[PDB]
């Protein structure tokens, strides 16, 4: 359980979909991010691993206009950019 604390913008996104804390496990962060994508319907209808985030908060956070869930390392990299790993 990698304990992390999301920076301001990411925390805003997590809260927008139900999150109530300031400290999370990476699993929790991924869960909320997934719910954000689903709630906003940012995925491609035909190939649902494709995510469109241009002109969206997620796009500002990740720094890309689109991406595929298949891009595992890139996603973790884009996520960690918006987090700090607790010393604990």
């Amino acid at each position: 359980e990698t304990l992390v604390r999301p920076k301001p913008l990411l925390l805003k996104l997590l809260k927008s979909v139900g999150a109530q804390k300031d400290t999370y496990t990476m699993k929790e962060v991924l869960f909320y991010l997934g719910q954000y994508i689903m709630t906003k319907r940012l995925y491609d209808e035909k190939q649902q691993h494709i995510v469109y985030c241009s002109n969206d908060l997620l796009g500002d956070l990740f720094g890309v206009p689109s991406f595929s869930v298949k891009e595992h390392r890139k996603i973790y990299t884009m996520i960690y950019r918006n987090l700090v790993v607790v010393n604990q």
Binding site: L30, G34, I37, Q48, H49, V69, K70, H72, I75
Partner: peptide
């Protein structure tokens, strides 16, 4: 989507 996302 969820199915793919779980793979992370």
């Amino acid at each position: 989507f969820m199915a793919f996302w779980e793979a992370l």
